[PDB]
Amino acid sequence: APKAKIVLVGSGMIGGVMATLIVQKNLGDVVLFDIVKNMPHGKALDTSHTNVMAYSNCKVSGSNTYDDLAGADVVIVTAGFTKAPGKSDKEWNRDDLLPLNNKIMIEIGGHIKKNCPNAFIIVVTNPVDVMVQLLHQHSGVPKNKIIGLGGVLDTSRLKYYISQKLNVCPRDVNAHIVGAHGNKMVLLKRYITVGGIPLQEFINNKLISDAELEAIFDRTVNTALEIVNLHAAPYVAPAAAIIEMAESYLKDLKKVLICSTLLEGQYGHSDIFGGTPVVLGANGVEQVIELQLNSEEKAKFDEAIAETKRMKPLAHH
Amino acid sequence: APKAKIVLVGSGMIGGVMATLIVQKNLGDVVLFDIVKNMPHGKALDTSHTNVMAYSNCKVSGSNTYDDLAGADVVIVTAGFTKAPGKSDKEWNRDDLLPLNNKIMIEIGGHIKKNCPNAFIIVVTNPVDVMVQLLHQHSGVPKNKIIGLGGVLDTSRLKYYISQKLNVCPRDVNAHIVGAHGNKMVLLKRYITVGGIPLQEFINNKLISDAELEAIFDRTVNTALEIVNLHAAPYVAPAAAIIEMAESYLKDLKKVLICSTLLEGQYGHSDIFGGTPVVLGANGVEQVIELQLNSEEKAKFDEAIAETKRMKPLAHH
Amino acid sequence: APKAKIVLVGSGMIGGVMATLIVQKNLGDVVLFDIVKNMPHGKALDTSHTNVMAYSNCKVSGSNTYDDLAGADVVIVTAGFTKAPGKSDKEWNRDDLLPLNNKIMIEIGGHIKKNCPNAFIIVVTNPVDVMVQLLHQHSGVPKNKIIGLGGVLDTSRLKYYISQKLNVCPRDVNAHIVGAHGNKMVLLKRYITVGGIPLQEFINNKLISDAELEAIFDRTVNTALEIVNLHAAPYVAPAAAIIEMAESYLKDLKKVLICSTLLEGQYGHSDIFGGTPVVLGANGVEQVIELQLNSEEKAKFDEAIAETKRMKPLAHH
Amino acid sequence: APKAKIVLVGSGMIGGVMATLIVQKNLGDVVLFDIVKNMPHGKALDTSHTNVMAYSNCKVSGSNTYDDLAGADVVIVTAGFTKAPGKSDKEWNRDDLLPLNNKIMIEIGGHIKKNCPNAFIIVVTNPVDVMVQLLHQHSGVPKNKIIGLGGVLDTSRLKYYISQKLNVCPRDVNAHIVGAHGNKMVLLKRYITVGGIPLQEFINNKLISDAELEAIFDRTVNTALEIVNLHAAPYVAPAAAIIEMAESYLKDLKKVLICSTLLEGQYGHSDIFGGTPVVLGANGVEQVIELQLNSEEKAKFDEAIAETKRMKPLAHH
Numbered sequence A, B, C, D: 001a002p003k004a005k006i007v008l009v010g011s012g013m014i015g016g017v018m019a020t021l022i023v024q025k026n027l028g029d030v031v032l033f034d035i036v037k038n039m040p041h042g043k044a045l046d047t048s049h050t051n052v053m054a055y056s057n058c059k060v061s062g063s064n065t066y067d068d069l070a071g072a073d074v075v076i077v078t079a080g081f082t083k084a085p086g087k088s089d090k091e092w093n094r095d096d097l098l099p100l101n102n103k104i105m106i107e108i109g110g111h112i113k114k115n116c117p118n119a120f121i122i123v124v125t126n127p128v129d130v131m132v133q134l135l136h137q138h139s140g141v142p143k144n145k146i147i148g149l150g151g152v153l154d155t156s157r158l159k160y161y162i163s164q165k166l167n168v169c170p171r172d173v174n175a176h177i178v179g180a181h182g183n184k185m186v187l188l189k190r191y192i193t194v195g196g197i198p199l200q201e202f203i204n205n206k207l208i209s210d211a212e213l214e215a216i217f218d219r220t221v222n223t224a225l226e227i228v229n230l231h232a233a234p235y236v237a238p239a240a241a242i243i244e245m246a247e248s249y250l251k252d253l254k255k256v257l258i259c260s261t262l263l264e265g266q267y268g269h270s271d272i273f274g275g276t277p278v279v280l281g282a283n284g285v286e287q288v289i290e291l292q293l294n295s296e297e298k299a300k301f302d303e304a305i306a307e308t309k310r311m312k313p314l315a316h317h
């Protein structure tokens, strides 16, 4: 009935574009919560005027008070740091953000548990597969109620780069990147399709070569780094990917979207979060889809999970 | 610059929903042309008021004059009959429409050639793979400028039925039905994916069985018949499929959409139209994608084409 | 959480376009209920495939069982007749539909009371201002939970016709037509704006003359008749207007939309429904806005209400 | 045919959100041009991946080369500075930006004249009513082909603030702010409507008081300042307003939108740009609407224009 209340814990660059897109889509009332005094109110105010241009009617409010999490239907956590200190852009590594963000998850998780234990949570803060589980553990939410951003975004890059080479609608390329959001992300060439057709047929037709695809894979993995090194920050597509996830939940679209979710034996892994296709609908994570990987792909998946696992103890520290 | 002018040659049930959806999408000015006196003006008038609710600004005009094809950017041909005479609903067969519609294509084609030889044409009238080629031949338009409706619609049924069984977003099922739009349409189980994942994995996981899929295939092929026999007429999804095609053209989306197009050696066939994925963009049919079918699938494709071919001489009569 | 369930009581022409638009907009699951055997299932089936083209995920089901009203969040009543018997198109009068539809409202109202007493109801069946109150009285729903279609549709015509003369975006003309949906509808020249600017300025600028506006008023009042007499049936804009209302409710947009609602002293009238701007949001009819009419406009409003009132006793018969 | 090419001259905060919204809306290919090395490529890259989530197909490219203006259909100029040096946020005044941005307009104008003299131009850089005319004069474009941002944005604030007080859909408040975008902007209480109804009726009904409206007017005028002083920057609504303008042009919507345009006697003013409602369509500024202001309102309009005029000679310096 009342619109969904969507609290953006973190009102930085991603938060700002998420607020924008929520109003564009009329998805629900938005709270831009941040620890920075007044900034979220300023961003909220600005954003709120777009209801007029968008023909929407979503309240957009800023907050510097954790208890505004109360009544949240969806909580999207981008709170934290994008860069580590003393580290240059060339040395940008999501792993280095771990010391910086760990303590922030715990605190937010405690606030979510107190204020909106029944909210659907999307964790973004890097290293996301680690931060999401830490938040899961501190917020107390059901495993079907929290996920991390990764695959929707990593695959939008891969999908997009292939679509440009093949000159097809970007969305008509489908692809899977799993395990973790980071330099070990697992790009599954075998699960790439174009217009539902195995990418291998386009390779057989010399429309795109294996070499080009290897360069696209490399680019995909290094995209965040590439953007950081172009004197920009990746936040527009991250926001759009998060909103697509939040939207599938809110409107019960049941889209299959690759997100970081609690693995309970899939791919041989339990007690960790990892990226895999899930179905996001009214009941949250409605299905966790386990790709029937081959042994080579599973080996890569293990390598990705091993990285998340390695940082599990460091996060919890 | 000026909006696209979209002439709907045929202002019956499909025409009406196409006009509706064009205004909803603000795709261009619409002409509802029909041979029935005044009906198209009445439908156009009604439809035109929806600009207000849709926040659009597309003119919608009725026409009983072929020369209103002048300046058309897109021409969508639904002109003809849905049912044959003396034939009951249980005996509904698209082939029987051939005697009834053949002469209508020729005439329209002559008008298109005179009035809008550079228009992009979408032929719908059944039996579509036959009628489209007849129109192609009489209108004189380039082969990259005309297609027939079939696969977008047949696959929306298959996609939809599978998505309901697997509880995923309908659009997340991708599937291919090729050769012809009719009882010989070729359903390619091998090219079905769900969230980009081979349907076989869901079958392996007992999430959907082969038997269920065979029933869904049967239903898909018989859908039009099923609808006709429920005391309804299939026209809403046909319209939406046509609009999705027209939209990809008009907005240069480059979607891969299975349509009836002139085959020039694909699948071993030339000098006939058949359903296959194509990319529809600014330049019309930008790419004709040839699925690398196996011999069994190709045999079915041949059977479908053989039917179109069989009726080629009857149409031209 | 679960999508809204929208039951279309009546699955005829308006019902069909409403189902189409609901899926286009992803507004909720739809039930096409009708007394005609199987037709609604056929229409629902057809419509359901458009989820694919629309990227939506709304179930569309047919029903021939009143109890499928159970759990309805919104009920839209188009059940009834568009034309009276023996009456020609030239003699088409909404009043004549009263004998034909009265008994249908009562029955539906009883089913709504039993099955979905907390649903938001939109009554369309003509003569709507009479049928809506009859349904209100039999369904038992709160006065903030039921309205009739009229002004959104009548004004879309007026708005549209003026926008064409002035060459502005249709939605940029705002206008009010109140009292009743019928030949006594009250067109308030004084409340017409174009881009928020009094229409009188455009008249002063000779951009549109009083005479042209009087012809547009006449056309607006006679539009339904004009469409019927063009061998068409007004149902596309009616559907779009109803969906805009249903949408404002469902998404809590709080749009000001002129609908038939229970008057409780506004304009000097009580215990009757009449068309006036209301605000439709999460709580239904959130505000009933009383235009501060002058005495001349109020006299017309009285004339409109007098007609509804005259038929009140005949309906209840 | 080919999509519109939209060059965003200036790829800062507003530019970034404009690129985002263009892809969301699939409006055309986008070039993010900036003088800052590589930043626009980084932003373009990020933005480009959203085609996937948006189902769009708009190229988004960065540029550090003026000649990428070639072939532009629309040019949106945000190039310049938001704050003056040594000036604190509390002292933020658009006028102070004049020395900083004047030289930038001239240069861009010369590039537009050389590269895309037939492009439709939207100038944003402050003080906009001054910068727009300077660009007009240097680019050589027809007066119907260039406008400045102001009223769509200033009025979205006023509209929004009133809609919150009255609890109606933001877009249902219409209002006019004219003359100039700055502290002398002219808020015309007399032209405010809510759901097409004179705001005075809501004031008469004590739904909003004159005092509240005066506070809302003050807030509206000071909004940019308020946002700057909340540790934020107004750029989301500016972007949305610009896109709504660009969109009306590109899709020939003919929306009435208040923009800065060349006055040729309206309001008694010639040879200057000032904010007034215009109709934006395929042919650019299709109509310049002159509000029939009273003498008090005209006096304010003169005060606003006098400010633009005062800075005319300083800009040209």
Ligand SMILES: NC(=O)C1=CN([C@@H]2O[C@H](COP(=O)(O)OP(=O)(O)OC[C@H]3O[C@@H](n4cnc5c(N)ncnc54)[C@H](O)[C@@H]3O)[C@@H](O)[C@H]2O)C=CC1
Residues within 6 Å of the ligand: A009, A010, A011, A012, A013, A014, A015, A033, A034, A035, A036, A078, A079, A080, A081, A082, A097, A101, A104, A107, A108, A123, A124, A125, A126, A128, A148, A149, A150, A153, A181, A233, A234, A235, A238
């Ligand atoms: N999972 C994924 O695919 C990716 C994740 N990222 C991670 O997203 C996070 C957000 O990126 P951006 O928005 O660009 O960063 P940002 O630095 O722009 O925004 C983060 C903000 O969170 C704040 N914040 C810090 N502590 C907080 C607390 N306790 N509560 C609320 N707010 C708090 C900040 O003050 C700040 O505004 C980073 O860790 C980045 O690496 C970014 C791209 C995609």
Ligand SMILES: NC(=O)C1=CN([C@@H]2O[C@H](COP(=O)(O)OP(=O)(O)OC[C@H]3O[C@@H](n4cnc5c(N)ncnc54)[C@H](O)[C@@H]3O)[C@@H](O)[C@H]2O)C=CC1
Residues within 6 Å of the ligand: B009, B010, B011, B012, B013, B014, B015, B033, B034, B035, B036, B078, B079, B080, B081, B082, B097, B101, B104, B107, B108, B123, B124, B125, B126, B128, B148, B149, B150, B153, B181, B233, B234, B235, B238
């Ligand atoms: N290709 C595909 O996947 C399918 C094709 N169809 C074919 O679509 C066609 C249209 O279906 P509906 O709209 O439902 O039929 P309909 O009978 O509602 O509409 C067809 C209309 O075309 C008219 N017409 C006849 N001759 C004409 C001429 N020379 N010029 C202009 N108009 C003319 C009619 O008067 C009429 O209004 C039929 O042949 C149907 O079988 C329908 C569903 C999908």
Ligand SMILES: NC(=O)C1=CN([C@@H]2O[C@H](COP(=O)(O)OP(=O)(O)OC[C@H]3O[C@@H](n4cnc5c(N)ncnc54)[C@H](O)[C@@H]3O)[C@@H](O)[C@H]2O)C=CC1
Residues within 6 Å of the ligand: C009, C010, C011, C012, C013, C014, C015, C033, C034, C035, C036, C078, C079, C080, C081, C082, C097, C101, C104, C107, C108, C123, C124, C125, C126, C128, C148, C149, C150, C153, C181, C233, C234, C235, C238
């Ligand atoms: N309020 C407004 O502005 C206007 C109201 N109308 C009224 O809308 C109603 C619907 O128009 P259309 O859809 O075009 O008519 P239609 O005749 O196409 O559809 C009406 C249908 O309701 C059915 N029906 C009859 N009794 C029923 C029952 N007990 N339960 C469920 N379904 C039942 C029919 O079988 C039928 O399919 C008519 O009374 C028309 O005058 C139409 C235009 C606007």
Ligand SMILES: NC(=O)C1=CN([C@@H]2O[C@H](COP(=O)(O)OP(=O)(O)OC[C@H]3O[C@@H](n4cnc5c(N)ncnc54)[C@H](O)[C@@H]3O)[C@@H](O)[C@H]2O)C=CC1
Residues within 6 Å of the ligand: D009, D010, D011, D012, D013, D014, D015, D033, D034, D035, D036, D078, D079, D080, D081, D082, D097, D101, D104, D107, D108, D123, D124, D125, D126, D128, D148, D149, D150, D153, D181, D233, D234, D235, D238
């Ligand atoms: N007209 C209106 O209603 C308002 C106008 N503004 C004016 O909009 C302009 C843009 O605001 P923002 O995007 O926030 O600023 P910003 O500082 O974020 O972006 C401006 C950028 O333009 C650049 N630039 C400078 N010289 C350039 C050149 N020769 N060519 C291309 N790019 C160049 C910058 O490097 C920079 O990235 C400012 O003057 C601001 O005051 C902002 C809000 C609304």
